[PDB]
Amino acid sequence: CSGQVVLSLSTAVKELVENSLDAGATNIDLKLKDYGVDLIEVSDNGCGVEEENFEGLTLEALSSLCALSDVTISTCHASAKVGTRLMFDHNGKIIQKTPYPRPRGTTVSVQQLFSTLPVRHKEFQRNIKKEYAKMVQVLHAYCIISAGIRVSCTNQLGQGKRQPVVCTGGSPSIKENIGSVFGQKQLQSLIPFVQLPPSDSVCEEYGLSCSDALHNLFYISGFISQCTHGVGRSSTDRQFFFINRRPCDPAKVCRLVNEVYHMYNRHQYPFVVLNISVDSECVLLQEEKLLLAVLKTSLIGMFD
Numbered sequence: 001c002s003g004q005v006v007l008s009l010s011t012a013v014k015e016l017v018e019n020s021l022d023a024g025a026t027n028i029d030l031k032l033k034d035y036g037v038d039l040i041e042v043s044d045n046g047c048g049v050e051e052e053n054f055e056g057l058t059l060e061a062l063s064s065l066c067a068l069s070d071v072t073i074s075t076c077h078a079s080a081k082v083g084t085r086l087m088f089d090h091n092g093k094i095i096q097k098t099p100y101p102r103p104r105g106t107t108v109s110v111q112q113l114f115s116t117l118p119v120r121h122k123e124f125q126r127n128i129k130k131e132y133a134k135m136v137q138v139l140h141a142y143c144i145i146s147a148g149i150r151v152s153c154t155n156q157l158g159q160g161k162r163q164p165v166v167c168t169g170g171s172p173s174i175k176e177n178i179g180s181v182f183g184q185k186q187l188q189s190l191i192p193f194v195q196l197p198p199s200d201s202v203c204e205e206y207g208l209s210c211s212d213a214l215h216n217l218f219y220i221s222g223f224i225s226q227c228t229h230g231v232g233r234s235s236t237d238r239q240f241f242f243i244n245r246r247p248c249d250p251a252k253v254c255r256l257v258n259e260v261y262h263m264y265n266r267h268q269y270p271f272v273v274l275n276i277s278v279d280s281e282c283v284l285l286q287e288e289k290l291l292l293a294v295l296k297t298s299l300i301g302m303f304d
């Protein structure tokens with residue numbers, strides 16, 4: 001018992017979406033009922049699971065989910081002649097296992113999240129608006145960065161009609177996924193990222209010298225709102241950062257990006273999509289000053 005316990009709806013959805021991604025899926029659907037309170041279903045056309053690894057499925061995030069909800073999983077592996085449907089108890093044990101015809105892939109159903117922990121379950125219901133918004137940001141993050149991957153999601157309140165949450169088209173480019181997620185009006189107020197060697201004045205302010213900026217292995221790419229008056233946003237609600245295609249919250253990078261923006265638009269925060277490509281062994285960050293230097297210089301060049 002050394003839990004990696006799913007603390008939230010957003011992390012439950014993150015863990016789930018990443019499994020699909022690690023499974024080499026190209027189509028990942030996410031169905032939610034009552035904002036996930038009643039149902040969180042992640043469907044994926046992936047490699048699926050082989051039958052000699054069923055019992056091992058919970059032996060990890062899936063084991064925690066089981067403990068915190070009623071999990072049902074149907075799956076089929078390329079090597080499989082027929083799919084399989086599995087029902088797990090709260091100890092991650094397989095209750096039932098029956099042949100089930102389905103295409104290659106996996107479908108994970110998390111029914112009634114947190115029901116085993118009354119207290120956490122009510123907190124979930126009371127806070128729902130924030131919990132859900134936190135998940136949407138996580139979801140959007142993966143939608144934007146997953147290129148060549150159709151990611152869809154719908155929400156259903158009670159017996160009402162299904163509502164739209166998001167739907168990308170498997171476009172091979174980030175720019176297109178942004179269009180899919182926030183629509184074409186957002187795109188028009190954006191300019192692509194243009195990287196520049198850190199400038200002398202900026203290196204000066206970051207205590208950097210030639211030797212410091214020579215082995216710069218930072219490759220930055222993405223989009224940002226123009227510095228044009230009004231074009232921005234009213235809050236930081238649409239700012240996405242990634243380090244090696246993985247959603248994250250670099251603290252310093254975030255402030256820096258906003259401040260450099262406020263220099264040209266004191267009254268608004270920008271829309272931000274920023275991926276930072278780096279050498280894994282250099283990750284927290286190893287040469288931050290260089291990066292911040294690169295960012296500031298590059299942003300300044302784009303905004304003037």
Ligand SMILES: Nc1ncnc2c1ncn2[C@@H]1O[C@H](COP(=O)(O)OP(=O)(O)O)[C@@H](O)[C@H]1O
Nearest residue numbers: 019020023044046048049057060061062063106
């Ligand atoms: N959607 C999925 N598609 C394929 N395999 C999956 C999926 N979800 C879980 N798995 C399998 O279950 C294993 C464990 O998942 P999980 O228990 O959450 O652990 P881990 O945190 O190591 O991914 C993975 O290594 C993978 O083989």
Ligand SMILES: [Mg+2]
Nearest residue numbers: 015018019061
């Ligand atoms: Mg996992």
